[PDB]
Amino acid sequence: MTDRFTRLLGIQQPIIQAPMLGVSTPALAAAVSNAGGLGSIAITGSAAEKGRALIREVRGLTDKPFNVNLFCHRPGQADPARERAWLDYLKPLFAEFGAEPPVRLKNIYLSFLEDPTLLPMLLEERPAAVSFHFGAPPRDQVRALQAVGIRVLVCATTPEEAALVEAAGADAVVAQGIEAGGSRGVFEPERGDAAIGTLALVRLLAARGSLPVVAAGGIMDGRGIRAALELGASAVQMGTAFVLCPESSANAAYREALKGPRAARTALTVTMSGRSARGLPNRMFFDAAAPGVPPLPDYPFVYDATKALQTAALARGNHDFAAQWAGQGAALARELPAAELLRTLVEELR
Amino acid sequence: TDRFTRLLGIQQPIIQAPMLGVSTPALAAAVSNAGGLGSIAITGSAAEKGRALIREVRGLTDKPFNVNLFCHRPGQADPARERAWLDYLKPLFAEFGAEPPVRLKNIYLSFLEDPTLLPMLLEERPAAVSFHFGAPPRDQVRALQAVGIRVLVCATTPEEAALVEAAGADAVVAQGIEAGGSRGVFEPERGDAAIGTLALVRLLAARGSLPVVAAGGIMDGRGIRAALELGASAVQMGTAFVLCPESSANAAYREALKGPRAARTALTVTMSGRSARGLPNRMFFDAAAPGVPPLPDYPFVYDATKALQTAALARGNHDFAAQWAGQGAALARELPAAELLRTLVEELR
Ligand SMILES: Cc1cc2nc3c(=O)[nH]c(=O)nc-3n(C[C@H](O)[C@H](O)[C@H](O)COP(=O)(O)O)c2cc1C
Ligand SMILES: Cc1cc2nc3c(=O)[nH]c(=O)nc-3n(C[C@H](O)[C@H](O)[C@H](O)COP(=O)(O)O)c2cc1C
């Protein structure tokens, strides 16, 4: 299965370094691709021409295939009244840092479904792989990418979501287990979250004998990779393992957090961004259902509010509101140059 | 690795999970005779009934087997809380022409509150004694080990695993979020880390000392191989054995697990008073919803639910049943237990 997948992508090793918005960089992606895996960058939140520049930066650092990731959520629905109430609720937190909340919130992460400039840019630049999170694009768009040689991956958290990935015509499904760090790939969180663990999810999707399955969530070493392959996966995707790499853009506080005792426990929160996401809990991790908490605005408007608070806190040296995403294998994190980490994972896999 | 197999004197690193209401002496004996470790659960029975169940297993196998006991913090009776809960359930009872019970009972005595259990186990000396929801005091673990019993305790986190090591147990059963039935969380009031099997097993094997038994979501030899790659010394499988004819799952449960409902499991605290995974039905609702009163302690809640199940059953209604199943439920197979064990071994090899 790994022979099939590595051949499908242009690569030597069945290991994808996860795209991680705010953490992956062209340097990180190129290091992993150079070492033989599939490096990744995340381009959502940037204008298409900035995305183009980022893709070109990676190409200036590696000749090998890499992965470009875009969010494909339902386009956020602005709700000024609900957003106003949310900001008013956050007011005392801003005031701790001598700040006021932003006067309005913005749709800071445009979905692939709402920014028509993204697809033609990708068709021009032709990265080896394009991946989607939160949903699959229409079949005709997936086809357009494939027509110029691009391999298309989509994340799914359930067999039902995997069926939609299949119907979209993707080349592979990234099976994201509950272990995974960062945003959950749930398509329609208003319907709930089955919260299936990696070991069950990968086996269920592989037992379907359709798309190659890339296991994502909680994998930190070659033993984890071997286990994923035993379950039927064709490859793995690893985020938390690469966060401490010097090539990533994690800041010092994030690295310190992930190296220390806080790594012993991760949690899910919707109050950071408006969508369920896993990280090291802090003051942004509260109960949205608690008395006094007004209704949550839509994703990604909530994250715009949180980013403003993060900025105010950071300006006073306070890191207690940071987005420090991490999977349930966080305590097994290592700090190595990314090429060395890739090499080490391959040795462990053998 | 032969770390677990040599510890228990068995041929195969596979435990058929103890499953209160589903495992039987016949199931345990079939699995043990086939070379694995069969298990029974004896909580909810008087010690002498537990003794009888242990003797039933011995009548059917000369091989090692596992006897499981709940080790939760003893439930505290609270008549006012229980009356409020019964009142909330009242319309459900009325739907079936029944009255709710007047009082709730502590139907599942913890190992910590029934002092007749330890002496009985010391006399009967099963090969393994296992504990769910907590570890007994070190002195009691030692008492069992002193007569040659291997002691297993379930843990859902590295912090709970540390308590298992502190208690001096022989092995830790790492229960991932995939697992069917009751979650082994020691102190649910502190929250639930809800760690998946793949992370949990690796964490315990990479950072701890004890042999790790992987539990949750494992349905075939590929799953067993995956667990061993993560560093487990054995596996424990519940859902996989539910459909065996030797189990005491009723027909509705068997048909539910075989049919389309197997595509979704969920956790509920409203069935028993403790978080547990199964095929969702009318007993699966949000305990934090508007108008829902505070939950009585475990296991008093389950006594209430059993009464409702009885009433619904009398009218041919199965929508309140406890049909526990793990997240690998869609991969369940229906075979004689010894034949399933043989198949798993072939798949493992
Ligand atoms: C800090 C961080 C950032 C992430 N950013 C993205 C992202 O921008 N887009 C995306 O599709 N997935 C993102 N992910 C999720 C990964 O693709 C993958 O599901 C996850 O990293 C696997 O879990 P692991 O961290 O245990 O390896 C991110 C994960 C983390 C920890
Ligand atoms: C119907 C059912 C009943 C169970 N009963 C018990 C029990 O009585 N005592 C216990 O310690 N574990 C019990 N378990 C949990 C198992 O020990 C084990 O954690 C779980 O079955 C593993 O998940 P799996 O069903 O995916 O194999 C039960 C599980 C199920 C599905």
What DSSP string describes B70-92?
E-PPPPPP-HHHHHHHHHHHHHH
Tokens of B37: 């470790």
H/E stretch holding A3 reads helix A2-8
> CA torsion, points A78, A81, A82, A88, in degrees to nearest 10?
130
Which is nearest to B143 in space by CA: B121, B113, B171? B121
Q: Which atom of ligand 1 is nearest to the CA of A240?
A: 25
Q: Considering only alpha carbons, which residue of chain A is nearest residue B348?
A: A230
- C-beta of residue A326 within 8 angstroms of C-beta of residue A243: yes
| Neighbour tally for B143: CB within 10 Å | 17
Contact present, B268 and B276 (Cβ < 8 Å): yes
The DSSP call for residue B274 is: S
Whole-number Cα distances in Å, A69 to A198, A295, B127:
21, 30, 53
Q: What is the resolution of this structure in A?
A: 1.4
- Type and span of the H or E element at A67: strand A66-71
Cα pseudo-dihedral B290, B291, B293, B294, rounded to 10:
0
How many CB atoms sit inside 10 A of residue A56's CB? Answer: 11
- Look up tokens 């009433």; give the residue: B311
Question: Which CATH number characterizes residue B17's domain?
Answer: 3.20.20.70
CA atoms within 13 A on the CB side of B16: 38
Taking every pair of C-alpha atoms in chain A, what is the biggest distance, in angstroms?
57
Closest C-alpha to B227, from B194, B209, B248, B204 = B204
Candidates A194, A200, A223; nearest CB to B230? A223
Contacts of A113 (CB under 8 A, 6+ apart): A72, A73, A74, A75, A135, A137
Put simply, the answer to whether A264 touches B158 (Cβ < 8 Å) is yes
* Cα B102 from Cα A276, distance rounded (Å): 42
Using an 8 Å Cβ cutoff, are A277 and A324 in contact? no
Q: How far is the CA of A174 from the centre of ligand 2 (A)?
A: 29
- For residue A224, the chain B residues in CB contact (below 8 A) are 198, 202, 230
Cβ contacts of residue A63 below 8 Å, gap of 6+? none
Cross-chain CB nearest to B225 (options A177, A230, A327) = A230
CB B217 within 8 A of CB A203: yes
Number of Cβ atoms within 10 Å of the Cβ of B166: 11
Q: Is A156 in the pocket of ligand 1 (CB under 6 A)?
A: no
List the structure tokens of B152: 């297993």
Give the type of residue at A124. Answer: E
- The DSSP output letter for A236 is E
Mutate to test the pocket of ligand 1, among A54, A325, A328 (most ligand atoms within 8 A of CB): A325
C-beta atoms surrounding A140 within 10 Å: 9
Task: Name residues whose C-beta falls within 8 Å of residue A311's C-beta, 6 or more positions apart in sequence.
Answer: none
Mutational test site, ligand 2, from B53, B177, B182, max ligand atoms within 8 Å of CB: B182
Shortest distance between the Cα of A208 and any Cα of chain B, in A, equals 11
- The residue range of the domain holding B240 is 1-349
CB atoms B178 and A196 under 8 Å: yes
Q: Closest-CA residue in chain A for B263?
A: A159
Query: For residues A110 and A107, what is the distance between their CA atoms, to the nearest angstrom?
Result: 6
Distance CA A263, CA A330 (A): 5
All residues at 6 or more sequence positions from A181 whose CB lies less than 8 Å from its CB, including other chains: A217, A239, A240, A266, A278, A279, A325, A326, A327, A330
Tokens of A85: 């109430």
- Which positions ≥6 away from B187 have C-beta within 8 Å? B73
CA dist., res. B196 & res. A202, Å (int): 12
| Of B300, B301, B313, residue with least CA distance to B268 | B301
Identity of the residue in A177, A194, A289 whose CB atom sits nearest the CB atom of B264: A194
Q: Are A16 and A247 in contact (CB under 8 A)?
A: no
Q: Are the CB atoms for B71 and B274 separated by under 8 Å?
A: no
Cα separation values, B105 from B114, B298, B310, Å: 15, 10, 16
Considering its fold, how many domains does chain B have in total? 1
Pairwise CA distance, residues A68 & A152, whole Å = 10
Residue with tokens 């029934």: B114
Rounded to 5 degrees, φ, ψ at B28 are: -60, -50
Measured between CB atoms, which of A201, A265, A289 is closest to B193? Answer: A265
Q: With beta carbons under 8 A apart, name residues in chain B contacting A163.
A: none
Cβ(B328) – ligand 2 distance below 6 Å = yes
Asked if B35 and B11 touch (Cβ cutoff 8 Å), the reply is yes
* Chain A residues with beta carbon closer than 8 angstroms to that of B262: none
Identify from B202, B218, B224, B225 which residue to disrupt to test chain A contact, counting A C-beta atoms within 10 A and taking the largest count.
B202
Q: Which of A152, A161, A183, A184 most suits a substitution to test ligand 1, by most atoms within 8 Å of the C-beta?
A: A183
The residues with which A151 forms a beta bridge, in sequence order, are A129
A220: Cβ–Cβ under 8 A, 6 or more apart, which residues? Answer: A238, A240, A241, A327, A329, A332, A333, A334, B202
- Rounded to the nearest angstrom, the minimum Cα separation between B178 and chain A is 6
If one counts every other C-beta atom within 10 angstroms of the C-beta of residue A47, the result is 14
Between helices A222-230 and A198-206, what is the axis angle to 10°? 40
Which of B198, B207, B237 is best to mutate for the A interface (most A CBs within 10 A)?
B198
Instruction: Judge whether B19 and B324 are in contact, CB under 8 Å.
Output: yes
Half-sphere exposure of A347 (CA within 13 A, CB side): 7
Q: Taking CA atoms, what residue in A is nearest to B215?
A: A199
Q: Evaluate: CB of A157 within 6 angstroms of ligand 1.
A: no
The conformation of residue A298, written as its DSSP 8-state character, comes to P
Experimental technique used to determine this entry: X-ray
Ligand 2 centroid to residue A69 C-alpha, Å: 39
List the helix and strand counts (H, then E) for chain B. Answer: 13, 11
Nearest to A276 by CA among A166, A194, A202, A175: A194
User: Is B318 within 8 Å of B252 (Cβ atoms)?
Assistant: yes
CA distance A54 to A39: 13
B281 CB near ligand 2 (under 6 Å): no
Which residues have a Cβ under 8 Å from the Cβ of B335 and sit 6 or more positions away?
B243, B244, B343
Under an 8 Å CB criterion, which residues of A touch B? 159, 177-179, 194-201, 203-204, 207, 217-221, 223-224, 226-228, 230-232, 264-267, 289, 327-329, 331-332
Contacts of B132 (CB under 8 A, 6+ apart): B18, B68, B69, B70, B71, B72, B154, B182, B184
Contact criterion met (CB below 8 Å) for B158 and A264? yes
| The token pair that represents B74 in the structure block | 């003893």
Find the length of chain B: 349
User: Two tokens at A165?
Assistant: 């990935």
In the beta sheet, which residues pair with residue A267? A279
CA-CA-CA-CA torsion sign (B111, B113, B114, B115)? positive
* Residue B173 DSSP SS3: strand
Phi, psi (degrees; rounded to nearest 5) at B33: -65, -30
Rg (CA), chain A: 19
CB A173 within 8 A of CB A153: yes
From the CA of A207, how many Å to the nearest CA of chain B?
9
Candidate from A159, A232, A332 with C-beta closest to B202: A332
Which residues have a Cβ under 8 Å from the Cβ of B255 and sit 6 or more positions away? none
Q: What is the 3-state secondary structure (H, E, C) of A134-160?
A: CCCCCHHHHHHHHHCCCEEEEEECCHH
